[PDB]
Paper text:
The paramyxoviral phosphoprotein (P protein) is the non-catalytic subunit of the viral RNA polymerase, and coordinates many of the molecular interactions required for RNA synthesis. Following the coiled-coil, there is a flexible linker that varies widely in length and composition between paramyxoviruses, and then a structured binding domain (the foot domain or X domain) that interacts with both the L protein and the RNA-bound N protein. Here we report biophysical and structural characterization of the C-terminal region of the P protein from Menangle virus (MenV), a bat-borne paramyxovirus with zoonotic potential. At the interface between the disordered linker and the structured C-terminal binding domain, a gradual disorder-to-order transition occurs, with X-ray crystallographic analysis revealing a dynamic interfacial structure that wraps the surface of the binding domain.
As in the prior crystallographic analysis, each of these proteins was fused to a non-cleavable, modified MBP tag, optimized for crystallization. For one of these proteins (MBP-P329–388), crystals were obtained in multiple conditions and used for crystallographic structure determination. X-ray diffraction data were collected to ~1.3 Å resolution for crystal form one (space group P21; two molecules in the asymmetric unit) and 1.55 Å resolution for crystal form two (space group P212121; one molecule in the asymmetric unit). The structures were determined by the method of molecular replacement, providing a total of three instances of the molecule. In each case, helix α1 of the BD is N-terminally extended beyond Ser339, the previously identified N-terminal residue of the domain. Helix α1 is capped at its N-terminus by Pro335, which orients the preceding residues (329–334) such that they form a clasp or latch that runs across the top of the three-helix bundle. In particular, Arg370 and Asn371, located within the loop connecting helices α2 and α3 of the BD, interact with Ser330 and Ser331 in the latch sequence, through their side chain guanidinium and carboxamide groups. The electron density associated with the residues within the latch is unambiguous, but relatively weak, and this is reflected in the atomic displacement parameters of the structural models.
Numbering used by the authors: 2 to 370, 1329 to 1387
């Protein structure tokens, strides 16, 4: 990583040209060059490259991936003053707290909504159960009721969760990674409803992000499910669209997993102060968020001063109604295993090559912790050993804060040995 410049990674569905404009302003004002990139699969590439001390100075993703990055030692603790923290909503800071430490700057709150074509469907269905009948009517007019991305479990989760599916059981502020909720009666009911839609030819198992976006924006389908980043392309499409609450299932709200788009600082970056400068004083300003939002809408931004304006938009009100019906995702390391397992279950069941029950049974075990935990007594001994070692051997306070955060998340002797090695390898 090159000292004296910033390299920033952000997903290709976000307002990266807008962010590059913020980068250009930073360079104009400070002399420091900013390069924005949008690599494919960056949520998988970041851990790969950062593990060897490489990669971007700043990484943007929803917060759910960030506990894994932090636990792996890839993220510095961020250092905003209390005065800066007060400029963002408290509920957003909780999404980016890991083992007591702030690990990223929250940018914006993302929840899926039902997006509908008002010309085809002036009053969109309140319930999932209404959709088959609606699709039959629209099929007789050469249209379809609903198309959305069936390849990414983010989009199907709101239906799986509606009647009781859950990721990890959450009690007394803690997630139990041995207690997974993807093959309970509610998860089965929701995924069965989706698979039935496909069986009855109301949806196609092959539908992906591009296929659904193209169909909605051409007026071929009456409804889609998507986030605020999608509104830009609909605005130029001519479709007269609305954004509303997701349909209920078995009388229960759809419960989207809510993401907070967040910006973390690579632990190996020699540019941590520049990164803080850019994020606090350029990006998290009304002007900076406007530039990104104008490119692709962010959703409900974390910066109070700008959200006061955006919240007046009915599309943002709908976003936040859906967010309130769902749940802020956990940020725990096990989230990537969860998402891979649910991805597999939905694709395999939707393709008809496996039953819903078998798909979700496999996912239930595949999402859960694979390795055993140490006993409570042994684990406390390992943690106290490492805390002593960090204080003994690591002179830099920021580096100590990072390692102390990682200590909080070890689960077994192998984790203890792995983290001990990382501490012993710490450079000056
Ligand atoms: O599908 C699983 C995927 O869900 C979320 O990714 C969202 C992301 O949060 C949105 O900002 C947008 O980019 O759509 C993605 C869905 O394709 C999780 O954040 C991600 O970790 C998980 O793999
Ligand atoms: O929060 S409490 O601990 O009080 C009850 C939590 N508990 C979780 C599991 N679901 C099963 C739904 S179903 O999938 O079986 O319908 C019921 C509610
Ligand atoms: O935060 S980063 O990881 O990017 C680099 C932080 N780094 C720590 C060490 N000090 C030495 C001050 S001096 O006495 O050498 O001037 C410079 C700043
Ligand atoms: O020192 S402490 O009492 O806290 C725990 C020491 N204890 C030694 C035995 N191994 C068994 C795993 S294995 O070696 O059989 O793989 C677990 C850890
Ligand atoms: O949800 C709505 O109704 C907004 C109004 C303009 C475009 N869609």
């Amino acid at each position: 990583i090159e000292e004296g410049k910033l390299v920033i990674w952000i997903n290709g569905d976000k307002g990266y040209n807008g962010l590059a404009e913020v980068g250009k302003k930073f360079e104009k004002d400070t002399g420091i060059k900013v390069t924005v990139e949008h690599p494919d699969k960056l949520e998988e590439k970041f851990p790969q490259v950062a593990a060897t001390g490489d990669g971007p100075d700043i990484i943007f993703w929803a917060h759910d991936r960030f506990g894994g990055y932090a636990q792996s030692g890839l993220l510095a603790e961020i250092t905003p003053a209390a005065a800066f923290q007060d400029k963002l909503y408290p509920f957003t800071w909780d999404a980016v707290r890991y083992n007591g430490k702030l690990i990223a700057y929250p940018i914006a709150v993302e929840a899926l909504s039902l997006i509908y074509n008002k010309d085809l469907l002036p009053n969109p269905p309140k319930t999932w159960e209404e959709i088959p009948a609606l699709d039959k009517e629209l099929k007789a007019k050469g249209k379809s009721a609903l198309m959305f991305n069936l390849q990414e479990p983010y989009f199907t989760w709101p239906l799986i969760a509606a009647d009781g599916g859950y990721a990890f059981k959450y009690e007394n502020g803690k997630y139990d990674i041995k207690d997974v909720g993807v093959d309970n009666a509610g998860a089965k009911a929701g995924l069965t409803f989706l698979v039935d839609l496909i069986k009855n030819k109301h949806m196609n198992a092959d539908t992906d992000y591009s296929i659904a976006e193209a169909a909605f924006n051409k007026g071929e389908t009456a409804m889609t499910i998507n986030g605020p980043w999608a509104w830009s392309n609909i605005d130029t499409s001519k479709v007269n669209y609305g954004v509303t609450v997701l349909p209920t299932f078995k009388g229960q709200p759809s419960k989207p997993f809510v993401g907070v788009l967040s910006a973390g600082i690579n632990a190996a970056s020699p540019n941590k102060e520049l990164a803080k400068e850019f994020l606090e004083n350029y990006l998290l300003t009304d002007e900076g968020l406007e530039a990104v939002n104008k490119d692709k809408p962010l959703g409900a931004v974390a910066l109070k001063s700008y959200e006061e304006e955006l919240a007046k938009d009915p599309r943002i009100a709908a976003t936040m109604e859906n967010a309130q019906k769902g749940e802020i995702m956990p940020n725990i390391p096990q989230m990537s295993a969860f998402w891979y397992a649910v991805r597999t279950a939905v694709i395999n069941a939707a393709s008809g090559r496996q039953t819903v029950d078998a798909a979700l049974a496999a996912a239930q075990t595949n999402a859960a912790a694979k390795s055993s935990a140490a006993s409570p007594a042994a684990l406390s001994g390992y943690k106290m050993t490492l805390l002593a070692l960090i204080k003994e051997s690591i002179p830099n306070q920021a580096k100590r804060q990072k390692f102390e955060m990682q200590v909080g998340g070890i689960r077994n002797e192998q984790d203890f040995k792995n983290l001990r090695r990382e501490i012993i390898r710490s450079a000056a």
